[PDB]
Amino acid sequence: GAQQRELERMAEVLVTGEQLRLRLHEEKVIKDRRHHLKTYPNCFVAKELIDWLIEHKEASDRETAIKLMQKLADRGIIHHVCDEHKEFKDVKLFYRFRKDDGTFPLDNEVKAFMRGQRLYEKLMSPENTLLQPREEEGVKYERTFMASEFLDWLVQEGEATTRKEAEQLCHRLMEHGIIQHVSSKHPFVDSNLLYQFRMNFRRRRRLMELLNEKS
């Protein structure tokens, strides 16, 4: 129980950080920037991001905005572009998302959540209606999939090169609480059995959730 809850807290930070990284690229808060005759690619200015967080009503004041970003720095989501400041400071210093320079601190559980995120985005797209409601024993379940059909899809979509690899991915998703069997706890089996996502990758997190307990 405790370990699953801790992983879920980890997943909330990964999802929140990633949702933010994408918005800041689209808004051009992250871009290539000059300082002392050099160009620093894919970075943001700390003081500017604080301005932006307040403008977009993600934080009420600078003090709180800073706590939000310090959390992302502590969690390995962002870092100073030259690794010269562990503190997130409200000044003209440049910081970068670790995904954007290939320095993200990876482990097997992080990898699973990132795969899950990438999968779920596809399952939310207008062209994909694999996830379907199903009823079993007078109870209706939302957004279900048959295990076998989900493996077919993973290979079709290029998320796995083979069915074995697709099955292994699903075992990892199950292990880390990302998917679950419908109705009762059960392992993932390539089969007629029904599963659904347990982790929610759709919801737009409020950045203030980063100050939630044990985040």
From Swiss-Prot:
GO terms for molecular function: GTPase activator activity; guanyl-nucleotide exchange factor activity; phosphatidic acid binding; protein kinase inhibitor activity; protein serine/threonine kinase inhibitor activity. Keywords: Acetylation, Lipid-binding, Lysosome, Membrane, Phosphoprotein, Repeat, Ubl conjugation. It is found in: Lysosome membrane. Negative regulator of the mTORC1 and mTORC2 complexes: inhibits the protein kinase activity of MTOR, thereby inactivating both complexes. DEPTOR inhibits mTORC1 and mTORC2 to induce autophagy. In contrast to AKT1S1/PRAS40, only partially inhibits mTORC1 activity. Residues 16-99, 125-199 form the DEP domain. The modification Phosphoserine is found at S215. Changing R34A: Decreased phosphatidic acid-binding. GO terms for biological process: G protein-coupled receptor signaling pathway; intracellular signal transduction; negative regulation of cell size; negative regulation of protein kinase activity; negative regulation of TOR signaling; negative regulation of TORC1 signaling; negative regulation of TORC2 signaling; positive regulation of autophagy. The chain holds residues 21 to 235 of 409 of the full protein. Phosphorylation weakens interaction with MTOR within mTORC1 and mTORC2. Phosphorylation at Ser-215 by MAPK3/ERK1 promotes deubiquitination by USP7, enhancing its stability. The gene is DEPTOR. One of its GO terms (cellular component) is plasma membrane. This is DEP domain-containing mTOR-interacting protein. A motif (DDEX motif) lies at residues 197-215. Changing S215A: Decreased phosphorylation, leading to impaired deubiquitination by USP7. Associated component of the mechanistic target of rapamycin complex 1 (mTORC1) which contains MTOR, MLST8 and RPTOR. Associated component of the mechanistic target of rapamycin complex 2 (mTORC2) which contains MTOR, MLST8, PROTOR1, RICTOR, MAPKAP1 and DEPTOR. Interacts (via PDZ domain) with MTOR; interacts with MTOR within both mTORC1 and mTORC2. Interacts (via PDZ domain) with MINAR1 (via N-terminus). Interacts with SIK3. Inhibited upon phosphatidic acid-binding: phosphatidic acid produced upon mitogenic stimulation promotes DEPTOR dissociatiom from the mTORC1 and mTORC2 complexes, leading to their activation. Specifically binds unsaturated phosphatidic acid, such as 16:0-18:1, 18:0-18:1 and di-18:1. Inhibited when nutrients are present via a feedback loop: phosphorylation by MTOR promotes DEPTOR ubiquitination and degradation. Induction: Expression is negatively regulated by both mTORC1 and mTORC2 (at protein level).
